[PDB]
Amino acid sequence: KDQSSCCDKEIIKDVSELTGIISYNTEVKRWYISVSDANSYDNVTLYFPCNLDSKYMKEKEKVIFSGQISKSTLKITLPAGTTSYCINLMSINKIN
Numbered sequence: 001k002d003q004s005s006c007c008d009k010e011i012i013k014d015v016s017e018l019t020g021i022i023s024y025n026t027e028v029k030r031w032y033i034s035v036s037d038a039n040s041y042d043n044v045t046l047y048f049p050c051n052l053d054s055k056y057m058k059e060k061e062k063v064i065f066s067g068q069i070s071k072s073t074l075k076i077t078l079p080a081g082t083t084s085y086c087i088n089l090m091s092i093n094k095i096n
């Protein structure tokens with residue numbers, strides 16, 4: 001817990017033990033974790049980790065993760081009901 005966040009901006013909150021799928025965004029040239037909301041058809045949240053181990057940088061890698069989320073000033077083109085955050089990962093594990 002004696003660790004500083006890699007995100008530039010103020011931590012909003014922590015996300016805990018979320019299930020997501022890793023992909024690479026070719027516009028911003030970054031890896032992210034996509035978490036789909038079971039509440040609706042279009043609500044997806046993308047978490048862009050600034051401390052992701054390169055062993056997870058594989059298309060469609062399924063992980064369970066926790067971390068500190070912040071807003072990011074990253075300019076990214078996303079559909080209407082898709083939002084994104086910077087994340088300082090505190091835990092991440094591959095799902096088998």
Ligand code: NI
Nearest residue numbers: 001002003004
């Ligand atoms: Ni610590």
